[PDB]
Subunit: 200 residues, 6 copies
């Protein structure tokens, strides 16, 4: 079965979120996993796919960083790829995926990650939006442009952030489980941020 | 006589799009169809040609991308071109066409493709229009420059995208003619978005 | 001596455009015909000059793009310089005049062109205007920067464009003579587009 | 367990800034201190982390700038990290901190630092803000974009800075502990700045 | 003693301009003339000298172009310097004059000029301004930005340009002395253009 | 000991400025001199230092320029620095100076001056401002952004500049002490410009 069989997490408005963490290896087909997300975004999430990237530090002086992970969030799905260093050819599906015009790619503070993706991986997100700028602008409030995730979720939702803060506040001690929950939470939270700004 | 003898599709308006697919070689002459694209553009299309490009992704980093397909749509026609790698001289017709000032090349989210196209192929579209932004400014809706081909149509024309969302939701399993049909409805959706935008 | 003794065309408002075409080799003198345009442009056109360019696309990929000819139009004249490859020193006069302050160089869809001219042939134009943008602003119509040629002047001079549309509609079946008419007419139109713009 | 046993500096409002200065060697684990910064910022500072970097100038013409120290501040704590010459792997923690998204990074006059951090160490603060600008825009007082750490605190807050001015005025002669107080004073000060602008 | 011992020209406002021409070889001392320009721009020229440049085009492709001529003039004076290829140490003072902050350097279309001068001669103009460029905004007429030297004067001052128009209307049919006339008149007009935008 | 014992000059309002001129070789210690400027700046000079630079032009095309003169001005002191070529270790004291955010480095027409400092010497000014632009936004006059040092001061302070003007007008006949006089004057003027705008 190609389904999302990792832990479900309970949000704040009653809904839940699944899981699918893969230790992406050289011949790990991640396409069927990329399908759902797409299917879910198109049928259930208004065609937005929320994301985030994680970099292994490195040593142009930033040509050493490695794209160690990626988060993709829609209505009902979140996939966590723990990409390999270095990339193998099975990753074309990853590149092909990010170049699609079916969905807008939503992320917070991505200007830098995008140049990195370009210079260090040749990955192009043809349809991306750094969402803090549109947030601040749609609202005429400059400060939203310079907010991190948790805090950008607050100046747009106010939903209860206590649980997310308890995990983030103690991130050094948080096991892969609470760490995954924080990623699903803000992965869902930014979905709510975008629905609000564009459904407006 | 030079003709679009491929499958025909019906839009949410009884209209019928005439298609053609050329697997261009190193001795093929595609000029009779681009000329048919230009004619329908001038005579009955307010000199707009809508387009999209499709790359063979690759691993200077964005050096792996290579134009594998080009779609050119006019109100009446949709010309889908599957291209080889590398190009041969016979494709000079495509460069010459895209550099034309007779019509405006209407694309959706082509900012990265216009550049990868310029840098990777030398295919200058002197008169291209990333159509997105115009929408946001004209309609006074910030999110328009930030949507995929469909959602922009939905947000600008609010027509029926039923057949469209269905085929796209299950993309990796859609037959060839289903993928063409999706290209058709999008080509027709944007040729309408444009016609609706240049006159308001 | 020198005079525009080629085909003289009659415009829709009854005016005429004289013409001249030279098959520039590597020894000819093109000054004499450059004077006449600068004469008509200063005495009859008030430093108005409308041009267009044409490239040989060769297989940095745009490095091969070489200039094949240029169109220079004023009030009552249309000059055509068909260029060799490579260029010879007798062509220094086209460079000093295209980059002249004694006059300006109104172009339609020229940003890329300036790039190719400067970067590919050391061709600099110091006083240039990509007229769609000024047209768009001058008259509160965003879509004018994005129109190509016949539609900018349409949206702006609303003049008789049947004959023009009739020819370009079948560009491929047009004799080098009729293609002249189509170019002289769009040149005249654009000079008219600009005479209006500088006054608004 | 971790604590900050360096001196505290009861500010001017009666509060006490707890400080700590660490000499980072090739095996020093600073994760416990950064952990507490993020912890305090999140549970006590609204996820803002103000900062500043210290440069060793050496003899690209700017290739001789050497990041010798970095100051991180929340309302309760100010952490000083003084980097070793060979950056080993135990510094990837610092890098991962400047890259996180859990908090933001607000500095005074940081345009050349980040640019410089990016060129000499491969360090790109994913989410940071050059606050003088936000203050100028937020308040409509352009000049705020051009003030050093103090006139900015002065012109925005108008608080007592006698202790600070008297220390910086005789800077060449200031010893260790005194230097600590100046930056320390400036750390807490900028912490208040962002707090007063983030929601005004 | 060095003086402006060339012809004088009556301007249409009844005033006069004194001029000096010099072909620079290698042992030429131009400093006296520069001093006369500065003194007069300071004493009564309100510290804004009008300056224009001329090029020796030559087969980065534009790196063979040499700053062929340099015109430096204000109200009362005009200096024309024809340069050799390559420069000798005696042109350093031209580089220095062009660097002074005692005055503002004004010229028509300098955008490509400043680039070229920087790139092929290391000659930097530290305190420069595009006159027609400031002319446009200062008047709510976006097209003033794109005017050749004659028209800008025409459209901001609207005087009698018959004499100049007469000469720039038969360029090749004019001797060396006649070229200086237009140059010197080239100046006066911009001088008055600046003064109009002076206290507007 | 270290003090400003050069000529003292009387300004427009009867105040004075003390000078110091240092012929910096490889052994010169501007130490108590960078140190004294910092102080005068802090206690009595409104958190910034007015400053101007001057270049030695020698023959990348702009790499012949060598910073030969650094003028550092404050409330009461005009410190002067003539540099050697190339720099010795004794120039670390200088690089560190302009790296301080204790004061704002206010310059007039510094665009290229900040650019040459970077590519020529790798010298970085973190807290710099090209002040003419600020005056333009504040004082409501477009031109001030394009004014020289004296004209900007004239235009913002309507101060008597007869003294400065007479010296600048005949600059070639001015000796060392007369040029310092003018340099100290322009410094005082910009200092007065800075006090004025900071309050607006």
């Amino acid at each position: 079965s190609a389904s999302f069989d990792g832990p479900k997490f309970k949000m704040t408005d009653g809904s839940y979120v699944q899981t699918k963490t893969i230790d992406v290896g050289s011949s790990t087909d991640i396409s069927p996993y990329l399908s759902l997300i797409r299917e879910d975004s198109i049928l259930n999430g208004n065609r937005a796919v929320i994301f985030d990237v994680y970099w292994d530090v490195g040593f142009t002086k930033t040509s050493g960083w490695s794209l160690s992970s990626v988060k993709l969030s829609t209505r009902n799905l979140c996939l966590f790829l723990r990409l390999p260093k270095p990339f193998h050819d099975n990753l074309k599906d990853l590149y092909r995926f990010f170049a699609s015009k079916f969905v807008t790619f939503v992320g917070v503070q991505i200007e830098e990650d995008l140049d990195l993706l370009r210079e260090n991986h040749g990955l192009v997100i043809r349809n991306a939006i750094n969402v803090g700028k549109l947030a601040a602008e749609a609202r005429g409030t400059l400060v939203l442009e310079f907010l991190g995730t948790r805090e950008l979720a607050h100046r747009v939702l106010w939903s209860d952030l206590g649980q997310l803060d308890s995990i983030e506040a103690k991130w050094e001690k948080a096991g892969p489980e609470e760490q995954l929950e924080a990623a699903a939470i803000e992965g869902w939270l930014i979905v709510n941020v975008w629905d609000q700004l564009s459904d407006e």
